[PDB]
Design a protein around this ligand. Structure first.
Ligand SMILES: NC(=O)C1=CN([C@@H]2O[C@H](COP(=O)(O)OP(=O)(O)OC[C@H]3O[C@@H](n4cnc5c(N)ncnc54)[C@H](OP(=O)(O)O)[C@@H]3O)[C@@H](O)[C@H]2O)CCC1
Ligand SMILES: Cc1cc2nc3c(=O)[nH]c(=O)nc-3n(C[C@H](O)[C@H](O)[C@H](O)COP(=O)(O)O)c2cc1C
Ligand SMILES: Cc1cc2nc3c(=O)[nH]c(=O)nc-3n(C[C@H](O)[C@H](O)[C@H](O)COP(=O)(O)O)c2cc1C
Lengths: 375, 376
């Protein structure tokens, strides 16, 4: 089983290749990490296994979900420290995902009810609804388009939060640049309508994510920085006219950063739509051999370093990914929600618990969080 | 006792088990003419008292968007279909012909005089989807032509004539392919139908076309020989709707009314399940979980006065639970039936199943990947 061959992720000697994908769960009451997060990650940690935390706030304006953790205050650092200590006592490596939602927010999640910030003034269309603190779903408002200086301050918010993660004992951080959030709002040409140095060409639309990654690489080292992107996911109206083009341009920038710095990033982490059920339709699988369909392999081939694939992977699919060189590591989201011992289950090829969408974003520290049973 | 093998009275048709061959385009009907290979293919899969639904069958020269799909709009096609039906009936199976117009899901290569495909709209399917071309490449859907009410009535007439033709060929009945973004679904879904006449806008307006199609075929061959297939929640070919449950319920109410007005029940309602599963997103008109998906299916079933067939990713275990819980009366299987000619028997005995080869789903070979899948 290739999933359980060791892999050297930069400075971290992993004993297997099953990764916990980052997953917002909203148990961090008042944006402060709670003891329950420690129990949740401890359940899923394994000796030599890699974990990536739920998206974590980098500033008071970065939230778009209720009760998600921050790491921009020293109070949060102290609470994260206790969670990190418990995961490390199980021998796992854990990275903190740094998350700014950009325009995917609401006045209720913003200080003084301010407008959320983005690359643009265009709001997410009404095709999408935001989860509200009361449990209803609200409308995405009109965001404020930020100037060059505010962009530098946001970059500094990434830098300071990476430093805060190291201060909490995290082995590294992951830059959330996927799923139509702030970084994706600069990447995707379906969103970025700027005419300044951050908009227009492929090159200009990559400047934000380049500035963010370089800032954190300089602060804590390339080998403690992972970068997550989703060029082929159109979440929250974040589609690009050429996701192949955009993926390769990101890969180029990551390679140049690694070359300029003399060291490799911890990994590139690419996540894709899950098309598991498109086989049941007449035309669902037509086009599967086009280059744009082979995007995951194209980016892997162009990238120098560790590659984590994500989106719809199973035990069988993840084994195949590693053995074919499509990826070095495979991250699992939904399966890890309901299977705390997913690593053991994948190893034994044991049955897998089903997950419950209703309890993905509730505040209960136990129900739908830590009460999914072990084998 | 396996509930899949308790008998079922689907109108005047007495079935021995509830495992159904789902309708499956396979492209062996060279030049749109049923060939002997279809006879062998359907015979291999027929069982005593089993129900087979054929591949989508063209109702007119404009109705095709795959190569070498059969038609049933010529008498030559009727004659060749008759030999296939006879072979299936020889084994005691019930078989319905699925009548299928692809609408905008076509290409000039498939249309008379290279004309534009017809649809409710002039909007093409997006570049997220492809068409199978005759040479086996995957191509781009072109811009369709939106038809007026008179042309709509002529399409209705095509269905009616093709339904009469199927019964003439000996088919026990027909199925209306009103699902998966094809012509009928292009009228149903408000993600496709941007019309402003009496066929567009409101739900009732958007259900006009399928109502007239079903009523025409019902009146021509009798309601108990008509099945209706829909897919209210589906990504396929951009066929999304802002409210799939309410769209589904409105179709069900029209079917219930057609039944009450004609004094008889349709053969069945056939619903396919979504081609997706959510990942914690919140999109207008997308089902958010398998639970929301399951409730949608059962809500449609409970609202419909008659037989319910469910399809889309079913296994032996999920089919048994579906019938056991009363969520469906019959379960149609597609891909597993491609690779297991004796799928029914394998499900009865809980035997291992053959893998299937997607590569030969749509080739023209009369044997390879069609009839050479082994029996138990
Ligand atoms: N004894 C067996 O192993 C049997 C397996 N069966 C099926 O026959 C096929 C056997 O071939 P395989 O063992 O080499 O697996 P493969 O076809 O290469 O793909 C495995 C899964 O990945 C799915 N999958 C494929 N391509 C894509 C894609 N682009 N995007 C997302 N998902 C995809 C695929 O769906 P479809 O095969 O397209 O219907 C399938 O569910 C499989 O589809 C398998 O599920 C029947 C029952 C018996
Ligand atoms: C409840 C939930 C929360 C998620 N939160 C995040 C997140 O905070 N950051 C992120 O990059 N991806 C997030 N994702 C996406 C997952 O990390 C992962 O890419 C996706 O679920 C991959 O699908 P898989 O379940 O097939 O493994 C989340 C997914 C779910 C279902
Ligand atoms: C190769 C192939 C061809 C199909 N052709 C048709 C068709 O012509 N008409 C239709 O309504 N559905 C068609 N379908 C969808 C199937 O009828 C059925 O709903 C689907 O296979 C889902 O069930 P499964 O998991 O058992 O394969 C087709 C599916 C496949 C895989």
């Amino acid at each position: 089983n290739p999933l359980f061959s060791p892999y050297k992720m930069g400075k971290f000697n992993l004993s297997h290749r099953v990764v916990l994908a980052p997953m917002t769960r909203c148990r961090a009451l008042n944006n402060i990490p709670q003891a329950a997060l420690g129990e949740y990650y401890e359940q899923r940690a394994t000796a030599g296994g890699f974990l990536i935390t739920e998206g974590t706030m980098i500033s008071p304006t970065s939230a778009g979900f209720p009760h998600v953790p921050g790491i921009f205050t020293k109070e949060q650092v102290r609470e994260w420290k206790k969670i990190v200590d418990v995961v490390h006592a199980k021998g796992a490596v854990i990275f903190c995902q740094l998350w700014h939602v950009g325009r995917a927010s609401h006045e209720v999640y913003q200080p003084a009810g301010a407008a959320p910030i983005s690359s643009t003034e265009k709001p997410i269309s009404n095709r999408w609804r935001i989860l509200m603190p009361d449990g209803t779903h609200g409308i995405y408002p009109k965001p404020r388009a930020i100037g060059t200086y505010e962009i530098s301050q946001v970059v500094e918010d990434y830098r300071r939060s990476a430093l805060n993660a190291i201060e909490a004992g995290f082995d590294g951080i992951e830059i959330h640049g996927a799923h139509g959030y702030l970084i994706d709002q600069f990447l995707k040409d379906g969103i970025n309508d700027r005419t300044d140095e951050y908009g227009g060409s492929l090159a200009n639309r990559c400047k934000f994510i380049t500035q963010v990654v370089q800032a954190v690489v300089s602060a804590i080292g390339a080998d403690r920085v992972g970068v997550r992107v989703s060029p082929a996911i159109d979440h929250l109206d974040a589609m690009d006219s050429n996701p192949l083009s955009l993926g390769l341009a990101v890969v180029e920038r990551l390679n140049k950063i690694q070359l300029h710095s003399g060291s490799k990033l911890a990994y590139l982490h690419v996540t894709q739509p899950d098309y598991v059920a498109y086989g049941q339709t007449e035309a669902g699988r037509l086009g599967s051999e086009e280059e744009e369909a082979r995007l995951m392999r194209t980016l892997r081939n162009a990238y120098q370093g560790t590659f984590i694939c994500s989106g719809g992977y199973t035990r069988e699919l993840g084994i195949e990914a590693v053995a074919q060189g499509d990826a070095d590591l495979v991250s699992y989201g939904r399966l890890f929600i309901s299977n705390p011992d997913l690593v053991m289950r994948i190893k034994l090829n044991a049955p897998l618990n089903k997950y419950n969408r209703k309890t993905f974003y509730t505040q209960d520290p136990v129900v739908g969080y830590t009460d999914y049973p072990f084998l």
